[PDB]
Amino acid sequence: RHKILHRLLQ
Amino acid sequence: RHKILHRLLQ
Amino acid sequence: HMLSDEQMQIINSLVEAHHKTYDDSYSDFVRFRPPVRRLSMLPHLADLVSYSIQKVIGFAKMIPGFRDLTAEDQIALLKSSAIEIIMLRSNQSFSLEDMSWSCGGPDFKYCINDVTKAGHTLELLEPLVKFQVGLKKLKLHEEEHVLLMAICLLSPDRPGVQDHVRIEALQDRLCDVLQAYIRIQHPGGRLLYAKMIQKLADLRSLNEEHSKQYRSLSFQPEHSMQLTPLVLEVFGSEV
Amino acid sequence: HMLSDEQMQIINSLVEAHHKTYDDSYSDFVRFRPPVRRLSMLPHLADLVSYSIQKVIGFAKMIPGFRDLTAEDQIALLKSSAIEIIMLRSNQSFSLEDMSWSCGGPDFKYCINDVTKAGHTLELLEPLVKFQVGLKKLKLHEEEHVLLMAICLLSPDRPGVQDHVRIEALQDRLCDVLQAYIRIQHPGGRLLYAKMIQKLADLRSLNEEHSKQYRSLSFQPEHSMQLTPLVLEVFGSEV
Ligand SMILES: C=C1/C(=C\C=C(/CC)c2cccc(CCCCCC(C)(C)O)c2)C[C@@H](O)C[C@@H]1O
Ligand SMILES: C=C1/C(=C\C=C(/CC)c2cccc(CCCCCC(C)(C)O)c2)C[C@@H](O)C[C@@H]1O
C-alpha cells in the first residue's frame, strides 16, 4: 500500500 | 477488522 | 397516567451516562492540536471529532440493551450513527445568538467558516445550522435530549446491522419511554414527540452529506494523514 | 589534494535540503498535541515524530540520486531508516549540560523520563543518550552531519530494498565526498570518518530496540489510536 508515503514522495 | 472500536467496547 | 419504575430506570441510566460522557466546561479541548484560522482547521476538528466518538462509545455502552447486542451490531450501530450522535450532542454548545458552537473561549468558538476550513461545504453546513437552530428551539429537557441520542443510536435501518428485530425492540422500548415522558412531565409537549422523530429524518440526510464530503477528504492522502486512527476506522468503509 | 565540483555540488545540495527541512527555532511544535507530564507524552511525541518523518522525506527527496530510485526503493529506504535519521537530526537539539533535547521552552525540553511516558524503556533510552553524547562530542561540521544523514538513508542493507547495487553506489559516492571533506576541510579529523561510520552501526541496534518497543505499543489499540496515520504507515509492517 503506503498511500501517505507515495503522496509525500510525489 | 475494527481494532480500536473493539477495544473501546471492551 | 404516570411513568413506570422500568421507564424511570431507563431515564436515570441515560441521564447519568450523558453526565459521565459530556463536559460542559470543554476543558479537554486544550489537549487537541490547536485551531488554525489548506484546511487549517482539519487537525483540531479531527481531534474534536475523535474525542467525541470516544464519548459516544462511552454513552452507547450504558444504553440499556446495547451491551447485550453482538460486538458486530454494536460496531455497525456506532459506525453509521456516530456523526448523527455528534450532531445531536453538539446542540448543547450551539448558541442561537452567534449561530456557533461555543466551547470555552475565542479559540473554541466554532462557526460555519471554521468547518469549511476542515474540508466541508455549505451543502452540509447550511442544513446543519438550520437543524441546530430547530433542535435548539425545541428547548428539550435533558431527559428528552438523552432519549433522542439513544433512539438515534438504536435505529435498526443501518448498513451492517444483523439483528434488526432486537435493535427495533430496544428502540421502541426507548420511543415509548420518550412518548410517556413528554405526556407526563412536559407541559405543552403535545406536538414535541413528532417534531423530535422528524429531527432523526433530518440527521439521515445530514449523515449522507457528511459521508460524501468525508469520502472526498479521506481519499486525498494529504488530508487523510491529518485524521486520527479512530476517525479513519469509524468513518471508514471496512466490514 | 582538494574536492571536485561534483563533490562540492553534493555538499551544497545536502546542506540546502537540511536548511529547508530543519527549523532551529522549533516554532511548529505549538501545532502538536501538547506535552503532558497512562503514556501522557505519547500524543505529543507521536506528533513530533510524524512531523519529523515529513521533514526526513523532504530531505531524502533532495539527496542526489534518491529521486531516481523506484518509489518502492524510496519507500523501503525511508521505512527502515526514518527512526535512525530522526535520531541523527535530533542531535542538533541535544544538550550535554542537561542530557536533554531542548526545543524552545520548558514545554519542549525533553528528557529520558518524558520518552518513558511515550511507551519507551531504558533498554532504548540509555544507549540513545550515550549515542547522543558521543555524536555531540564529534563536533561535526554541518557538511558532515548532513552527509552522515544521507549516508544512513542510502544504506543498501535494509529489508525490502531491491536495487542494492544502485543504492550501494550512491552511498559510496557520498562516503567518498565525506572522506574527502574531512581530509581537506576538517583540521584534526584524522580519526573522524571511522568514528562516524561506527555511529551508523550504533543506529542499527538503536533502530532494532525502537522497533521492538514500538511493536509492543502498536499492538495495544489504546496506544496505537494515539499515533498518527503517517507514523503507523512508516513504522508499520505492510509491504
Ligand atoms: C463535537 C462536538 C462539538 C461541536 C461540533 C461540531 C462543530 C465544530 C460539529 C458536529 C458534527 C459535525 C460537524 C462537521 C464535521 C466535522 C469534521 C469531521 C470530519 C471527520 C473531518 O469530517 C461539526 C462541541 C461540543 O458540543 C462537543 C460535541 O461532541
Ligand atoms: C525528533 C526530533 C527531536 C527530538 C527527538 C527525540 C527526543 C524527544 C527522539 C528522537 C528519536 C527517537 C526518540 C524516541 C522515540 C520517540 C517516540 C516514537 C514512537 C513512534 C512512539 O515510538 C526520541 C527534536 C528536534 O531536534 C527535531 C528532531 O527531528
Domain spans in chain C, listed from the N-terminal domain onward: 1-239
Indicate contact of D with B: 3+ CB pairs under 8 A: yes
The pocket around ligand 2, CB under 6 angstroms, is made up of D 45-46, 48-49, 52, 86-87, 89-90, 92-93, 101, 103, 110, 115, 118, 120, 214, 231, 235
Kindly list the partner chains of chain B, i.e. chains with 3 or more CB atom pairs below 8 Å.
C, D
Name residue, grid cell 431507563.
Answer: C10
C94 membership: H or E segment, kind and range: strand C94-95
Gap between the Cα atoms of D217 and D126, Å rounded: 19
Gap between the Cα atoms of C210 and D161, Å rounded: 41
Gap between the Cα atoms of C168 and C156, Å rounded: 5
Gap between the Cα atoms of C234 and C227, Å rounded: 11
Amino acid at D99: M
Work out the end-to-end distance of chain D between its first and last CA atoms, rounded to an integer number of angstroms: 46
Residue of chain D whose Cα is closest to the Cα of C30: D34
CA of D90 to the centre of ligand 2 (A): 7
Nearest partner of C125 among C88, C145, C99, judged by Cα: C99
Measured in residues, chain B has a length of 10
Q: Confirm if D63 and D154 have CB atoms less than 8 A apart.
A: yes
CB-count burial class (<10 Å; 0-12, 13-18, 19+) for D26: middle
Residues 6+ apart with CB under 8 A from C124: C206, C209, C210, C213
CA of D39 to the centre of ligand 2 (A): 15
Q: Confirm if D178 and D147 have CB atoms less than 8 A apart.
A: yes
Nearest partner of C206 among C131, C153, C100, judged by Cα: C131
Gap between the Cα atoms of A2 and A6, Å rounded: 6
Gap between the Cα atoms of C180 and C186, Å rounded: 9
Is D89 labelled a binding residue?
yes
Q: Confirm if D13 and D62 have CB atoms less than 8 A apart.
A: yes
Torsion sign over Cα D52, D58, D59, D60: positive
Atom from ligand 2 closest to the CA of residue D210: 22
Nearest partner of D70 among D174, D204, D164, D148, judged by Cα: D164
Task: Please judge whether D32 and C30 are an interchain contact, meaning their C-beta atoms are less than 8 angstroms apart.
Answer: no
Amino acid at D207: N
* CA nearest ligand 1 atom 20, residue: C46
Q: Confirm if C96 and C136 have CB atoms less than 8 A apart.
A: yes
Q: Where are the alpha helices (DSSP H) in D37-141?
A: 42-60, 71-89, 112-116, 122-137
Exposure string for D78-112, b = 16+ CB within 10 A, e = fewer: bbbbbbbbbbbbbbebbeeeeebbbbeeeebbbee
What are C110's strand-pairing partners?
C101
What's the alpha-carbon Rg for chain A, to the nearest Å?
5
| The CATH number of domain C1-239 is 1.10.3720.10 | no
What's the alpha-carbon Rg for chain B, to the nearest Å?
5
Ligand 1 neighbour C45 (Cβ under 6 A):
yes
C-alpha separations of C134 from C2, C76, C123, C188, D47 in Å:
29, 28, 18, 17, 39
Gap between the Cα atoms of D95 and D99, Å rounded: 6
Give the number of whichever ligand sits closest to the CA of residue D211. Answer: 2
Rounded to 5°, angle at Cα C84 from C231 and C128: 105
3-class DSSP state of D70: coil
Gap between the Cα atoms of D15 and D8, Å rounded: 11
What are D109's strand-pairing partners?
D102
Torsion sign over Cα C13, C18, C19, C21: positive
Count chain A–chain D contacts defined by CB atoms under 8 A. 25
* CA nearest ligand 1 atom 28, residue: C90
Gap between the Cα atoms of D234 and D79, Å rounded: 5
Amino acid at D83: I
Is C120 labelled a binding residue?
yes
C173 membership: H or E segment, kind and range: helix C164-185
CB-count burial class (<10 Å; 0-12, 13-18, 19+) for C159: exposed
User: Which residues in chain D have their C atom more than 2.5 Å from the N of the next written residue, marking a break after them?
Assistant: 37
Name residue, grid cell 530531505.
Answer: D59
Is D158 labelled a binding residue?
no
Gap between the Cα atoms of C144 and C174, Å rounded: 11
Gap between the Cα atoms of D148 and D89, Å rounded: 10
C-alpha separations of C57 from B5, C146, C219, D103, D129 in Å:
8, 14, 26, 37, 41
Torsion of Cα atoms, D234 then D232 then D48 then C57, to 10°: 170
CA of D56 to the centre of ligand 1 (A): 33
C-alpha separations of C106 from C101, D64, D86 in Å:
11, 47, 36
3-class DSSP state of D91: helix
Query: What's the reported resolution, in angstroms, to a tenth?
Result: 2.5
DSSP assignment of D17-54, as one string? HHHHH--TT-GGGGGSPPP----TTHHHHHHHHHHHHH
The tally of CA atoms less than 13 A away on the side-chain side of residue C13 is 18
Gap between the Cα atoms of D63 and D46, Å rounded: 26
Establish if D228 touches chain C: CB-CB under 8 angstroms. yes
Give phi and psi for C226, each to the nearest 5.
-90, -10
CB-count burial class (<10 Å; 0-12, 13-18, 19+) for B10: exposed
Atom from ligand 1 closest to the CA of residue C90: 26
Gap between the Cα atoms of C63 and C70, Å rounded: 14
Q: Confirm if C110 and C103 have CB atoms less than 8 A apart.
A: yes
Q: Confirm if D17 and D71 have CB atoms less than 8 A apart.
A: no
